[PDB]
Enzyme design. Structure first.
Site, mmCIF file in Angstrom:
data_model
loop_
_atom_site.group_PDB
_atom_site.id
_atom_site.type_symbol
_atom_site.label_atom_id
_atom_site.label_comp_id
_atom_site.label_asym_id
_atom_site.label_seq_id
_atom_site.Cartn_x
_atom_site.Cartn_y
_atom_site.Cartn_z
ATOM 1 N N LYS A 11 0.817 -1.206 0.000
ATOM 2 C CA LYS A 11 0.000 0.000 0.000
ATOM 3 C C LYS A 11 0.854 1.260 0.000
ATOM 4 O O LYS A 11 2.012 1.240 0.417
ATOM 5 C CB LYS A 11 -0.947 -0.004 1.204
ATOM 6 C CG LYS A 11 -1.756 -1.288 1.321
ATOM 7 C CD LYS A 11 -3.005 -1.067 2.160
ATOM 8 C CE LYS A 11 -2.823 -1.666 3.550
ATOM 9 N NZ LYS A 11 -3.545 -0.761 4.553
ATOM 10 N N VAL A 12 0.274 2.350 -0.489
ATOM 11 C CA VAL A 12 0.923 3.654 -0.477
ATOM 12 C C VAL A 12 0.159 4.558 0.472
ATOM 13 O O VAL A 12 -1.049 4.726 0.333
ATOM 14 C CB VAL A 12 0.958 4.296 -1.881
ATOM 15 C CG1 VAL A 12 1.679 5.638 -1.834
ATOM 16 C CG2 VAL A 12 1.625 3.366 -2.888
ATOM 17 N N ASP A 45 5.402 -0.543 -19.818
ATOM 18 C CA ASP A 45 3.986 -0.254 -19.715
ATOM 19 C C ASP A 45 3.768 1.107 -19.067
ATOM 20 O O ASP A 45 3.527 1.204 -17.862
ATOM 21 C CB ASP A 45 3.258 -1.370 -18.940
ATOM 22 C CG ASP A 45 3.885 -1.661 -17.566
ATOM 23 O OD1 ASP A 45 5.091 -1.397 -17.364
ATOM 24 O OD2 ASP A 45 3.153 -2.158 -16.681
ATOM 25 N N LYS A 69 1.402 4.118 -18.562
ATOM 26 C CA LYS A 69 -0.027 4.412 -18.619
ATOM 27 C C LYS A 69 -0.292 5.858 -18.192
ATOM 28 O O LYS A 69 0.541 6.469 -17.518
ATOM 29 C CB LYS A 69 -0.798 3.462 -17.699
ATOM 30 C CG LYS A 69 -0.650 1.981 -17.993
ATOM 31 C CD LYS A 69 -1.176 1.169 -16.817
ATOM 32 C CE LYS A 69 -0.949 -0.321 -16.995
ATOM 33 N NZ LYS A 69 -1.480 -1.087 -15.824
ATOM 34 N N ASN A 95 0.348 6.675 -14.591
ATOM 35 C CA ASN A 95 1.737 6.771 -14.127
ATOM 36 C C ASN A 95 2.266 8.208 -14.073
ATOM 37 O O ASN A 95 3.319 8.469 -13.480
ATOM 38 C CB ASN A 95 2.668 5.913 -14.999
ATOM 39 C CG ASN A 95 2.240 4.447 -15.076
ATOM 40 O OD1 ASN A 95 2.588 3.743 -16.028
ATOM 41 N ND2 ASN A 95 1.487 3.983 -14.080
#
Ligand SMILES: CCc1cncnc1N1CCN(Cc2nc3cc(C(F)(F)F)ccc3[nH]2)CC1
Ligand SMILES: [Zn+2]
Length: 321
Positions: A24-25, A138, A140, A143
């Site tokens: 988790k962040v 990848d 996105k 990001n």
């Protein structure tokens, strides 16, 4: 005295910013030392299920290595890193500007002059990564974060933010054809991603989509590019040169890389020296009323054989200056 220990109790959890998955962040406040009161993002990897797959270990360690060696204005800054028995901790700068593409829903569409600014910033981050042999892969819309000043910051050089499960995990709509069919990847993939991100900026939607997964893959592989008639001739040309099935034919695919892409007429008005210095005012400067300011559902705060562990040796970090 001496150097500061820097363990989990040095930080108090303010709120969730995101959760996987492998962890988790949190938004956190430093509570000890001379930094007392400073807001950070704290990434917490559950380390006991990372070591169960090699490729996830690879990403976790690559990240820890990349955030130490790579420091660039348009890349998220790592401040502290440490480990506690079963857990890995990355302390990074709190990017109070939120997601860039969250502005899309508000704006409907970005204007080219606006999109150009942020694309120029992303392309500079991509340029530096490729200089250091790093290919994102990848990339996105999610990001692309923004700092307190509204400038771009690349994030997620780690494992996978998804809870489900790593291409095909989450959303695939911004990934190059050669990554999809799993037959080699190189710098060119990141220029595809740039094109796809651009198209989303200027149309509000990714270039190729489907009702299901199979149809989406096909639509990308077919690479039938549809260009809206409101786009300038320069923007039309860049997307055509960035979104090619053949990776070799792509713009920036050669040794020219970022500088080649950055040389396209679409960026003809960018002063690169000023951009990199962040002297250029960004089109969306966010207004913040405190350091710990949130504008990004998240709400409800928790945690701040055996001996076969030699993988995260030397994981601990504290950033220069
Ligand atoms: C940490 C940098 C950041 C700074 N300031 C504000 N927001 C930020 N982010 C940037 C990263 N982002 C997406 C995200 N990546 C994740 C990775 C995981 C993982 F544990 F790896 F599985 C879990 C949840 C995740 N959510 C949301 C919070
Ligand atoms: Zn995944």
């Amino acid at each position: 005295r001496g150097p500061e220990k820097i363990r989990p109790e040095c930080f108090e959890l303010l709120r969730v910013l995101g959760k996987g998955g492998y962890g988790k962040v949190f938004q956190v406040r430093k509570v000890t030392g001379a930094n007392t009161g400073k807001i950070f993002a704290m990434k917490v990897l559950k380390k006991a299920m990372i070591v169960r797959n090699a490729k996830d270990t690879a990403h976790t360690k690559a990240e820890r290595n990349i955030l130490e060696e790579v420091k660039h204005p348009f890349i998220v800054d790592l401040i502290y890193a440490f480990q506690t028995g079963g857990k890995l901790y990355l302390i990074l700068e709190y990017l109070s500007g939120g997601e860039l593409f969250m502005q899309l829903e508000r704006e409907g569409i970005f204007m080219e002059d606006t999109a150009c600014f942020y694309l120029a910033e992303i392309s500079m981050a991509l340029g530096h990564l490729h200089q250091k042999g790093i290919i994102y892969r990848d990339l996105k819309p999610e990001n692309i974060m923004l700092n307190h000043q509204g400038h771009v910051k690349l994030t997620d050089f780690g494992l996978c933010k998804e809870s489900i499960h790593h291409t095909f995990c989450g959303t695939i709509e911004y990934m190059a054809p050669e990554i999809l069919m799993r037959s080699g990847h190189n710098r060119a993939v990141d220029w595809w991603s740039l094109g796809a991100l651009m198209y989303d900026m200027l149309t509000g939607a990714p270039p190729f989509t489907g009702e299901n997964r199979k149809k989406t893959i096909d639509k990308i592989l077919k690479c039938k590019l549809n260009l809206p008639p409101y786009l300038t001739q320069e923007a039309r040309d860049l997307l055509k040169k960035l979104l090619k099935r053949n990776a070799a034919s792509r713009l920036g695919a050669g040794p020219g890389d970022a500088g080649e892409v950055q040389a396209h007429p679409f960026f003809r008005h960018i002063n690169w020296e000023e951009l990199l210095a962040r002297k250029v005012e960004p089109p969306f400067k966010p207004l913040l009323q405190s350091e710990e300011d949130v504008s990004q559902d998240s709400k409800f705060t928790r945690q701040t054989s055996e001996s076969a562990n030699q993988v995260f040796l030397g994981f601990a970090y504290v950033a220069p200056s």
